[PDB]
Amino acid sequence: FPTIPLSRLFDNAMLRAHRLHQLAFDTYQEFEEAYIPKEQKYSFLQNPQTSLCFSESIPTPSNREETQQKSNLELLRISLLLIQSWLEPVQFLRSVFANSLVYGASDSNVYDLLKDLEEGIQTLMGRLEDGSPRTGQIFKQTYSKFDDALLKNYGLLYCFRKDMDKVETFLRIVQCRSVEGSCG
Amino acid sequence: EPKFTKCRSPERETFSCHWTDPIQLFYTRRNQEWKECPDYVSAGENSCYFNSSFTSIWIPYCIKLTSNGGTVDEKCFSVDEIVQPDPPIALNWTLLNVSLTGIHADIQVRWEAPRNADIQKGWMVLEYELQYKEVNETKWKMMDPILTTSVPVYSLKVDKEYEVRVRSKQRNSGNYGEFSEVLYVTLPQMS
Amino acid sequence: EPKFTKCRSPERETFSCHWTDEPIQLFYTRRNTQEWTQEWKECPDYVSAGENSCYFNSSFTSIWIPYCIKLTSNGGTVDEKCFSVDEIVQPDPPIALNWTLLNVSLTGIHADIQVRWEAPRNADIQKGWMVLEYELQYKEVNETKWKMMDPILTTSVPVYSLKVDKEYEVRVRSKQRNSGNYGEFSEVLYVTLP
Fold it and tell me: Which ranges of chain A does DSSP label H, i.e. alpha helix?
């Protein structure tokens, strides 16, 4: 039978990651611009916990240098955990999404896209077994669990955008390393 | 023997297979256990429809047409291979300007992506190919694939009627769908 | 009273903040430890990013982590700001803008050109750390308004139906996919059709 070339695998993955990230950004920007003034944004970012996302239980790289030091398997693993951590919490963004003027922004669509991307990363990890010993707190740990509404919605939305950015970014790094020619 | 016509995915989210001519269809998502067609009706006679719940872009499928228990046809493929877009819609054209001689004109052809693309925002890409020719001509003149929904056609002769048709394809995947309705370009005589 | 103008990371690796002149110092803290809201430090480099600025190289820059920054005039706090370096990305402009003729109508009136360029030299698009999209704009040197094309994801693009007699100017600018960027336009390219 035919085997999907790794390149088409990566491209579909990137289409999903990107769409999720774009949806997060657009709804986030939209919420902020209408309900959150700089004042509260600043307060939020320095408030106890608040600026802390549930998904931070997962050790992820924070800069180029560190990201680039991770093996392909770890980067995919990390991205998997990040996706999985949102399968449940998105339900909470339902009210935000219902009032959003963003197409595709719904708890159901967002959930399906997360599920499809999850199958994608799982598919990739099965192909990209490249040295990296399946040992470490990354391979020995699960996704993160979630616990004024406005702020709660705002923090949920602020973290969604951020985690989707990590995913799109992490997958890209692996793409350029594996799929020669997709970047340069 | 009843054989396969084709399987085609219109938007990389679902697909369906059709055959000719008691025929049954069995599939497997060979990442033997065949499961039968989840729907024989939605797509009409001699077809099996696989909605978004049965379609995965990540794994290859295999189907076998079983005429009276016996297998009469078999094929394996990935959804990516059977993608084949719906033709573009709402073809229109604009008159840019006619030369000084009054012999040639420069027009602009415009269209809209098929409705099932706008839905699949970010999932379907699409590059279109426009072809044109004098009504009473045999060959079709072809323009190279573009990602935009507007392109200009230059050097047409005012003293002739032309026809234009365009088809879409997913960016480097699947194959070209079917042509749009032909747009007939008639260039007016200028004073 | 000195105020911050803006901060910016040209390539998601380093960033700098600038303020208006009107002693002034810059103190920052990052959420690299919960006990941060009070463990302030001073601008690691008051010169590199130019006059009235503060520059944070790679060792002082992390993405996805909140940074709080405050400006003091004679020890007194006159301004404060909070952000994430990913939130402040704004790439440099494209390099090597050029154009090739594509088509010429027989009416002698229209020609299609192919405009191409190169991404900012400091953006790491090669190893995937950055992904840019471009906005190309062009117009006749006598038009007040600029025509802008929908976001381009590649480094080349055809603009269609340029009138052969008129002269044109084209500018292009970058943006990290899904950010609040769009840096500065490139140097204007003047197109005089052959």
Answer: 6-35, 38-46, 64-67, 72-87, 94-98, 107-127, 149-178
Domain containing B137 equals 86-186
Q: What is the CATH number of the domain that holds B124?
A: 2.60.40.10
Name the fold adopted by A1-184. Growth Hormone; Chain: A; (1.20.1250)
Distance CA(C81)–CA(A152), nearest Å, equals: 22
Chosen from B100, B103, B106 to mutate, greatest number of chain C CBs within 10 A: B106
Same domain as C167, residue C81: no
Residue among C64, C126, C127 minimizing CB distance to A162: C64
The answer, for C178 touching chain B at a CB cutoff of 8 Å, is no
β-pairing verdict for B47-50 and C147-148: unpaired
Q: Name the strands in the sheet holding B23-28, side by side, starting at the edge strand that comes first in the sequence.
A: B35-36, B23-28, B61-67, B70-77
Experimental method: X-ray
**Are B107 and B158 members of one domain?**
yes
Across the interface, whether the CB atoms of A62 and C64 are under 8 A apart is answered yes
Do C160 and C69 lie in one domain? The reply is no
Q: How far apart are CA B180 and CA B173, in angstroms?
A: 20
Integer Cα distance of C158 and A75 in angstroms: 37
Query: d(Cα B24, Cα A106) in Å, to the nearest integer?
Result: 38
Amino acid at C92: D
And the tokens for A122?
A: 């799982």
Cα–Cα distance, B150 to B91 (Å, whole number): 9
The resolution in angstroms reads 2.5
Q: Please state the separation of Cα C84 from the chain's center in Å.
A: 16
Judge whether B60 is closer than 8 Å to chain A, CB to CB: yes
Same domain, B94 and B136: yes
